[PDB]
């Protein structure tokens, strides 16, 4: 395998981290290949769940807890800290909140969160690599509590970063927020990609095509599929009670991705940097509720 940039995996990985048995587990947690039978039963269906009041309360809770866990990771971002060390702290923070870390054993994914440095678009596997001054790193968190999953991510700066990194991260965040601002009942899911690509393109960046936002509730990933690029064929119209993510991945160079031999790490084919931000959203009569928002601070971590 020819690596596309400077990043390499840093092995060995620590043995899988156990989750105490008192924490409620999703179906895939104990499947030998980490398959989710509840999800697979709906594979190829485009119908979107309308959440009940109980569902909404469940989503508010797990999304708030997921935010707390992302904030834990954010506080650890500094030169010399390994992504494995971030993952260990995330794992413990989930357990402390009586939550299962959703990525863990999801289709045999080996860790409790995804850490995506520089040219890694998404699904980076926490490993022994110390973060370096100038790096950008995304941490993508998902928690499972009482049958519900809550999902968010932010890109962080490691020490002082260059102008390109600042512009990339800022633009990606703006892309997410412009998309969120358009969410309300009656809007087609396919419209969000038009909004995101317009803003990315205006700043000389490209939009990843192979990975999309998704419905999330009792399932980790389900209908609708939410592409982030323009003129896509996403099926569905937003209705009050829909819960889904928007999670644009934006690139300095071209949009093309490839996967490392580990089967997970998605990287830019040109080795240039990529950034991502993500919220879980509930559609309401007036627009949407950002379930994974900060409650105590106005801005994402890269601005604070
Ligand atoms: C956004 C997303 N992420 C994952 C993933 C898997 C492991 C850890 C973190 N995230 N999986 C997703 N979908 C998978 C399929 C998949 C797997 C790997 C990359 C893309 C899609 C599914 N529905 O079973 C999807 Cl749609
Ligand atoms: Co994912
Ligand atoms: Co996520
Ligand atoms: Co997501
Ligand atoms: K990245």
UniProtKB/Swiss-Prot annotation:
Quick one: which residues bind Zn(2+) 4? 151, 214, 247, 278
Residues the record lists as binding Zn(2+) 3: 140, 151, 278
**Cofactor(s), by name:** Zn(2+); Co(2+); Mn(2+); Fe(2+)
Q: Name one GO biological process term.
A: proteolysis
GO terms, molecular function:
aminopeptidase activity; initiator methionyl aminopeptidase activity; metalloaminopeptidase activity; metalloexopeptidase activity; zinc ion binding
Cofactor info, note text: Binds 2 divalent metal cations per subunit. Has a high-affinity and a low affinity metal-binding site. The true nature of the physiological cofactor is under debate. The enzyme is active with zinc, cobalt, manganese or divalent iron ions. Has high activity with zinc; zinc cofactor is transferred into the active site region by the ZNG1 zinc chaperone.
Q: What is its EC number?
A: 3.4.11.18
- Keyword annotations of the record: Acetylation, Aminopeptidase, Cytoplasm, Hydrolase, Metal-binding, Protease, Zinc, Zinc-finger
Q: Name one GO cellular component term.
A: cytosolic ribosome
The question of whether Ribonucleoprotein is a record keyword is answered with no
Q: Disulphide bridges in this chain?
A: none
Q: Which proteins does it associate with, and in what oligomeric form? A: Associates with the 60S ribosomal subunit of the 80S translational complex.
| Functional summary from the UniProt entry | Cotranslationally removes the N-terminal methionine from nascent proteins. The N-terminal methionine is often cleaved when the second residue in the primary sequence is small and uncharged (Met-Ala-, Cys, Gly, Pro, Ser, Thr, or Val). Required for normal progression through the cell cycle.
Q: What is this protein called?
A: Methionine aminopeptidase 1
Q: What is the organism of origin for this protein? A: Homo sapiens (Human)
Quote the range of the complete protein represented.
Answer: 81 to 384 of 386
